[PDB]
Amino acid sequence: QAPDPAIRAALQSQPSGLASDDWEAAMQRIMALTTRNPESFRQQPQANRLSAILEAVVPSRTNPTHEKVLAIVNALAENKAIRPDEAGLVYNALLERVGRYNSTNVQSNLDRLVTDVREAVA
Amino acid sequence: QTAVPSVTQKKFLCDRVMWRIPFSSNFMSMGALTDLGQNMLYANSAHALDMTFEVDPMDEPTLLYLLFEVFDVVRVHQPHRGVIEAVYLRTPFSAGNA
Amino acid sequence: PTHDVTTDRSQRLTLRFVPVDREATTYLYKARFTLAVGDNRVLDMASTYF
């Protein structure tokens, strides 16, 4: 079937490993609640043992603007509304328009579109 | 069978190289972030450094070219076309997040 | 690695053992030491040299 744009978008814009989004999985590592291996975190060097603690306690706010728009431009290609090579052009254009006019309403409507377009590819 | 008494002089020449004193517990390189420099990472202390060099009675004025190994890196953001932003960072000799 | 790779107590990297007893001959020459390798530490013999 046609791959889900939202899954594919997260497959090229989100850290492969752990990020602030995976906070619940991060806290299980730093407190040995993982069934796989609880003693992994205890044995890390102090440098990358504290940096993981600080992030988990106070999460870092990020910018989801680029992830949302990448989901849309990935969905447009699967409907062939744009040529695959045009994906670079469209991604940077939409991004600029949203920047030029960002605001809360805009951000929320981009979110509706992301859902709507998944259903549309289906 | 005529040799005169003599004294022995020793010296050495080590050119094309610079001395190094690695800031590690056992002077050994196990990684970029040394163990000793890893202690003061999140502590907000501030040491002071004093060093005394005893070199030689040279005839001409000279300089002591000294290096402090640091971490100078840069992250390069390219959000939009024609937009490039760099974030520099030196941790021991601070240089700002410009 | 931070903790379990190197110690924090006082420790000497290089030791110098003087001969405890020396015997000499016309051609032979014999020396005798006592290695006395500390405690809670391990010496690799491929570092000692007369």
């Binding site: 044995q43 890390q44 060097p45 990358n48 | - | -």
Partner: peptide, 26 residues
Amino acid sequence: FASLAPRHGTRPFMGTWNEIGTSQLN
């Protein structure tokens, strides 16, 4: 699992289980 080995960010550096060793004149 004695991890007192250098890191590579995470996932401690390396080691091949089989490597303790032999050689002779042959």
